[PDB]
């Protein structure tokens, strides 16, 4: 449920400020306070997000997510307030995944080959369909929502790193191409130069970011779980 | 007649003289 506390409920026009303290912002991340700040910066709406929500009711498109149960794990959209990674806007060349049902949404994530993409609609521009068009409606005037406007695709576990030599990064990309003879073009980004292609395909493979531009995918990887007492992890 | 099948490799990419020195003995 709650990492530290249950997020406060304030009856909407309030700009939640920065806190220098490290252990104070974590329960604010529990409150989904940061994603509301993303709206004020790019969507330009003062909609408080997740009253009573926290991290105990947020659901993702997968039917069962083990990572959602372990709220200690850190989400890509939650790594933006802490400063490791950043989510950006969506380009016209970028398109939706027809996987989930976009009902009553304003902000949903999509990790990509390059980075993390967040999409926005207007406050009152209700998202009642999977399309890009946002539809006006008066039913979402109230800001109370059990993560209805916040649906997150993917099951991503985030953590700090120690970077790798540029040569080590180069080994993965070449080997990844070898592992995937058929995959040639991904998201328009070149993976292997090939001939003419068909456009429509939902593609879902495991990936990993090592701090480099090209994402690394795998099919025969072996993960390893070790936990150590780190002052950041307290 | 051992053989091998090829996958997705990692193939990498002036003056030179031969200057032989000697010859040994074999035929058949």
């Amino acid at each position: 449920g709650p990492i530290i506390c249950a997020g406060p409920i304030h009856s909407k026009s309030a700009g939640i400020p920065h806190l220098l303290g490290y252990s104070e912002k974590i329960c604010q991340i529990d409150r989904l306070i940061h994603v509301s700040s993303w709206l004020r910066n790019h969507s330009q709406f003062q909609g408080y997000v997740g009253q009573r929500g926290g991290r105990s009711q947020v659901s993702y498109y997968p039917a069962e997510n083990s990572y959602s149960r372990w709220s200690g794990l850190l989400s890509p959209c939650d790594a933006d307030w802490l400063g490791m990674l950043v989510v950006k806007k969506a380009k016209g060349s970028d398109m939706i995944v027809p996987g989930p049902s976009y009902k009553g949404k304003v902000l949903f994530e999509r990790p990509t080959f390059d980075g993390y993409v967040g999409w926005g609609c207007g406050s009152g521009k209700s998202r009642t369909e999977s399309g890009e068009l946002c539809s006006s409606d008066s039913g979402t005037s109230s800001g109370l929502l059990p993560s209805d406007r916040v649906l997150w695709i993917g099951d991503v576990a985030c953590q700090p790193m120690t970077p790798i030599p540029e040569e080590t990064f180069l080994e993965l990309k070449s080997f990844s191409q070898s592992e995937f003879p058929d995959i040639c073009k991904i998201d328009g980004i070149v993976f292997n130069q090939c001939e003419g292609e068909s456009l429509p395909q939902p593609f879902d493979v495991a990936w990993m970011d090592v701090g480099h531009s090209h994402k690394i995918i795998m099919r025969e990887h072996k993960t390893k779980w070790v936990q150590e007492s780190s002052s950041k992890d307290f | 007649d051992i053989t091998a099948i090829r996958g997705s490799f990692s193939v990498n990419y002036a003056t030179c003289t031969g200057e032989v020195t000697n010859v040994s003995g074999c035929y058949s």
């Binding site: 070898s178 | 007649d1 051992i2 053989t3 091998a4 099948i5 090829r6 996958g7 997705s8 490799f9 990692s10 193939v11 990498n12």
Partner: protein, 51 residues
């Protein structure tokens, strides 16, 4: 205790000793059962049956 390990292959197929030398300079040793169409997996390339 005195412990024995066993495996019932119940057959006999010719095999050879093979040394591999990747063109980068790396070398890998392995015992492939070249009598059968076995596929020993290493690096990028795979060898298989012989005569």
């Amino acid at each position: 205790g005195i412990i024995w390990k066993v495996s019932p292959c119940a057959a006999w197929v010719p095999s050879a000793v093979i040394e591999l030398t990747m063109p980068s300079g790396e070398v890998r040793t392995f015992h492939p059962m070249s009598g059968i169409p076995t596929q020993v997996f290493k690096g990028v390339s795979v060898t298989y049956l012989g005569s």
